[PDB]
Amino acid sequence: ADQEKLFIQKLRQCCVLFDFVSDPLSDLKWKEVKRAALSEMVEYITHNRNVITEPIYPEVVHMFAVNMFRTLPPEAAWPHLQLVYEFFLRFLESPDFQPNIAKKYIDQKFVLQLLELFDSEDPRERDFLKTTLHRIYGKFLGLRAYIRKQINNIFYRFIYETEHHNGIAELLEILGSIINGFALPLKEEHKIFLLKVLLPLHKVKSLSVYHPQLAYCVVQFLEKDSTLTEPVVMALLKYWPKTHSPKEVMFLNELEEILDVIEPSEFVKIMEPLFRQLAKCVSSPHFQVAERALYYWNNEYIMSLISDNAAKILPIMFPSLYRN
């Protein structure tokens, strides 16, 4: 076409990474042109219908790759980077977007380089990456298996290896969306992922950074299959901070969220070792830990579980008042 010609021209124009070393006026002029070009195409692909044709796909993916797939410093050109993120996001979210054509260019190497950007120290960038990968996962069925494995590899390298990662939280938030949409009978690889990966994540000392997201994944797993709650709770009690620390509040938060979605038949399977730990928390030297544990009695659903099993639980919580 003719509009298609100009669109492709502007996309390729944003593939030129220039830098005027000693001419501030020309540098600002150049950076503005690219900023304007990106802004134009963002508005264009967003509000105009039937503008994404087949020749556009290899151009957009290339422009994204050239601009984003870089090396992270241990940014400053974020205004341009955010535009690229927003444009590529409008590209995927468009009603005219056809995965059948795009899967030729959005391949495993693209997904791999996209995942390597999750190690960015910029929270804004990881947020754009979280949204993008979530969209790619849902729109590309043939990539879902590869994505899960690579995310799995990053976690294993974060836990048992030594590689520090800055996007563990953002990655866990993506998984939460995936877990919530699992098939009726959970596959074995999913159960393995819960037991061999998600649970040992509680061991890492930097748990505080990604704990809310980790807890959500664990809970969503139990809402799918309540059978998995016994190895989950027992492992949670294993990884429980032996050294009385304010980090106990996180475990207490996660534990109550688990109890809010637990089955009665599953409750009696782990109620004794749980409330023995809970009893220790009420007797804690740290007030914050005791305050959090005592708040369990306010949970009306837990009370019903306790009342149904008061003969076994009450002697644990109040030894000088009750016996077996």
Binding site: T131, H134, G138, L141, G142, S177, I178, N180, G181
Partner: peptide, 11 residues
């Protein structure tokens, strides 16, 4: 808000 759930499909 959270990310919209992704329904699992045969792979």
């Amino acid at each position: 808000p959270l990310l919209s759930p992704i329904p699992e499909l045969p792979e």
